[PDB]
Design a protein around this ligand. Structure first.
Ligand SMILES: N=C(N)NC[C@H](N)C(=O)O
Ligand SMILES: N=C(N)NC[C@H](N)C(=O)O
Ligand SMILES: N=C(N)NC[C@H](N)C(=O)O
Ligand SMILES: [Mn+2]
Ligand SMILES: [Mn+2]
Ligand SMILES: [Mn+2]
Ligand SMILES: [Mn+2]
Ligand SMILES: [Mn+2]
Ligand SMILES: [Mn+2]
Lengths: 313, 313, 313
């Protein structure tokens, strides 16, 4: 049965807007733990990581808050590796996606053979040298790829990092806003991806069939799902820092996760970029969090066709 | 040509909210009869069933308004069997889905070999003993299935009922909120269904291909379509008692019905759960009724590709 | 590389509502030229056609403003043929779709072998004798089809017209509101089309596969894409004269154009029916124009998966 390890990560210095550090709060008050337990889920809450304050953290070239970001991920990596050693699926209620660096890092320490599925409107694969924004939530994957070692300069706060995944161990789904440098990296490293164009062409059904086959083809291995809230259309998750029109639908979002759950291989989960303060109205915030919870519950068994206990009703 | 028999069924005691008894009214004033006639439809209106008032109708265990519900369906069954004997397709403009009991019952009296397609966000297959809500609009199918005879206790008002369909003669489409007892019944009786997950996986095209093949495989037989308005997403039909996000789209709704029409086998039709009083704004009511009419017109020939008469334009 | 020739066509007398003549304006101020240049596009703006005023233009039977419409298209045809001779893809920022007559006409003068893809909720194939509205924006295709020569009476202003395409050289996508006479013409001339029903059945992926195969089967030839803004659902392009619910999605709209771009055969493009004055709110106008620009940029290379230059990033 799916045993979960909850990790609240109220961090925002991976991007300019601040309300994202409130993500764990709103998701918890939405009753996420209760609802997960309302299922057959064994849930242990490891709490909200107390993220230090690094007042002295000047830019590294154009890269912003490098020491703060580097420290949050280093802290998070230890936590994630802790829950993984406790035999539970790590659920990181995040702030910004920069935390992916620590989440996937800590997960790989315990399961070096993990495969990653990255649901996002963006690739977040900019290097400190290709980024034009300097925001680290758009650079996580670059720190994690072994093939990019030698192209990632020494950024204050990330000396603890060691690339744990190969370009062949990750699949993107939902892309619709990729920088030119990021696109160059995609095609150069031969990274497997399904942009909104491929979802439109093939259908989410075929997309998931190919994604799982691609990652679990040679052999079965742990799965790390890093779900960026903006991967879904802004009509479903408006309270997010960088929304892009024409995203994955609510149904597609649930299909992605229902399928992953069914592999029985989900090992790590990230629910990122939910920023309640960016909701233009009280219900945009409610609509976003509700959708984020729904997708989280899907990862752990909630099926739209229904569920029932091993009893004769 | 599609000859129709209209039956207004202003009934609401199958669920707690009352505005649903206004369904026939708003659908008629939307010009449904005129529009149907604006097509090549032969339409005879059998009127709005005068539903009796049963002041004395205490709960049966937890089941609410059993005598009122049982009587409305018994009345409706006779009407439907009447129009079927008049060689016309029964169109039941309903209130709540509890009326399905009488609609399908009366239809089967004349055509015991009918197949049922149930478009709904719910299975409505709870028994008086599995229901937790006590609302009869979520129990109709349980009264109709032969295999469940022996599990349906004697509820005041339904002694006239006799299960007329087998688990193999029904197909669900659109499910996204099924109780645990209902899910147990689905898998136990081996009922064929396409939840939103299957629609996402296969596409409405394949879904309809399999549905009709499944029901008309061995041989051609009359079709009864019980369309619950909440089977479509609440962005299309918001004025309904129990809306559930992530529903069938407008297009899918029309595709379902255009395909059924084309079989030339539509024998019975239910348009249920439209509740004008639940629309939060005047246009939510207009948007709901408009969609309900559009889907009704599709059942009787209106095609999105166009239609034309046997003349040289 | 895609070299473009911009042609502003502020014309509205092809239909009753007037704000459509503002289409070139809002599209230009949305930064369309800048954005196209922000790509690898060679853009030359031929300006906004100064459309004459024909005060004396009484109806022809029921056909409205025939001389004004006929003159605008005649003018436009010369312009389009001019840009085509300059070796550039004609981009007609239009007013109403009646301009299609001149756009496709002028294009065919230089490339008589062109194939047409018509994205629209309507067929716009009514003849002066089949039309019931008398509005010429719903009759363009009838003037262009060789097979309909002999059925198009002499309308003041169109004596310069000479049917340049056969029924076999055009494909419709998005149809959902076709008159009976139009439908008769579709089936009689055996015109290939994909109404919303076919998109629902096959998926936009298969639809585009069949469309391009159909038109480029025997051999490769120039493509003329006449994109009517109302071909997309009104939730994306509300500021348009004749919206119809259940249209093509934003994603589908981009998929259509991304695919066409990739053929490397786009030869002519029409962006029609954008009417800023019909937007009920300031953002409905913004949402419409934004979508119209997005689809225009897709026609010329902008891909959702990303783009990059031939350099080592
Ligand atoms: N993670 C995001 N939103 N990335 C977008 C943009 N390429 C940036 O790297 O700042
Ligand atoms: N028909 C509905 N809405 N059913 C839902 C719920 N299972 C109930 O049986 O009350
Ligand atoms: N182009 C449009 N909107 N056509 C619709 C209608 N058949 C008319 O020809 O006026
Ligand atoms: Mn993102
Ligand atoms: Mn991201
Ligand atoms: Mn329902
Ligand atoms: Mn129902
Ligand atoms: Mn149109
Ligand atoms: Mn048009």
């Amino acid at each position: 049965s799916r045993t979960i390890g909850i990790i609240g990560a109220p961090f925002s210095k991976g991007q300019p807007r601040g309300g994202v550090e409130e993500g764990p709060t709103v998701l918890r008050k939405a009753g996420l733990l209760e609802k997960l337990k309302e299922q057959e889920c064994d849930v242990k809450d490891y709490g909200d990581l107390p993220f230090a304050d690094i007042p002295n953290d000047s830019p590294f070239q154009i890269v912003k808050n490098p020491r703060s970001v580097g420290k949050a991920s280093e802290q998070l990596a230890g936590k994630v590796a802790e829950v993984k050693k406790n035999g539970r699926i790590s659920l990181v209620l995040g702030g910004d996606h920069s935390l992916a660096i620590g989440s996937i890092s800590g997960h790989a320490r315990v399961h070096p053979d993990l495969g990653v599925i990255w649901v996002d409107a963006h690739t977040d694969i900019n290097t400190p040298l290709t980024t034009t924004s300097g925001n680290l939530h758009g650079q996580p994957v670059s720190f994690l790829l072994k093939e990019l070692k030698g192209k990632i300069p020494d950024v204050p706060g990330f000396s603890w990092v060691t690339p744990c995944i190969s370009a062949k161990d990750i699949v993107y789904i939902g892309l619709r806003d990729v920088d030119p440098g990021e696109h160059y990296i995609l095609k150069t490293l031969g990274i497997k991806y399904f942009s909104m164009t491929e979802v439109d062409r093939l259908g989410i059904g075929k997309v998931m069939e190919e994604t799982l086959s691609y990652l679990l083809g040679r052999k079965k291995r742990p799965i790390h799902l890093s779900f960026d809230v903006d991967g879904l259309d802004p009509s479903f998750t408006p309270a997010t820092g960088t929304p892009v029109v024409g995203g994955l639908t609510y149904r597609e979002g649930l299909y992605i996760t229902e399928e992953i759950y069914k592999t029985g291989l989900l090992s790590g989960l990230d629910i990122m970029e939910v920023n309640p303060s960016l909701g233009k109205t009280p219900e945009e915030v409610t609509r976003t969090v509700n959708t984020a919870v729904a997708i989280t519950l899907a990862c752990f068994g909630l099926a739209r066709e229904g569920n029932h206990k091993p009893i004769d009703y």
